[PDB]
Structure 1
Amino acid sequence: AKSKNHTAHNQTRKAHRNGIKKPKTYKYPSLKGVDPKFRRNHKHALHGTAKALAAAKK
């Protein structure tokens, strides 16, 4: 009672029914996988520029 093993028929038509879509890019993307040494300094860089503008519009 052998059956049919595998086929790719109707697979491209099914994928195009709802359409293949873009990954919906955003501004300020996720920082997963970035260098931890660079990210440790960037956290302090934003801390110093937040209080700099706080002392400019005090």
Structure 2
Amino acid sequence: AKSKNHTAHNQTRKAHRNGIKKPKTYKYPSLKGVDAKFKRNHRYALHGTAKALAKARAEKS
């Protein structure tokens, strides 16, 4: 038998018809893998932060 083993010919053509596209960026990236101790605490700081801001607006209504 015996055939072609390997070639990257035509592979950059195929990647550039519709790809080699940069991913979109968002204001909030996903926090997967950030330290758990900080992430647990970041929950309490934000919930408490929301409490303070909620009261400031409830006064101003």
- TM (norm. structure 1) is 0.90
**Unmatched tracts of structure 1, length 5 or more:** none
Counterparts in 2 of 1:35-54, with a 5 A limit? 35-54=35-54
Between the aligned partners of 1:13 and 1:23, the Cα distance in structure 2 is: 20
Between the aligned partners of 1:28 and 1:44, the Cα distance in structure 2 is: 18
Comparing both structures, which one devotes a greater share of its residues to helix?
Answer: 2
RMSD of equivalent CA atoms: 0.9
- Partner secondary structure for residue 37 of structure 2: helix
Between the aligned partners of 2:19 and 2:41, the Cα distance in structure 1 is: 42
**Residue of structure 1 in register with 2:5 after alignment:** 5
Percent same amino acid at aligned positions? 88
**Unmatched tracts of structure 2, length 5 or more:** none
Q: Which runs of 4+ in 1 moved over 6 A?
A: none
- TM (norm. structure 2) is 0.86
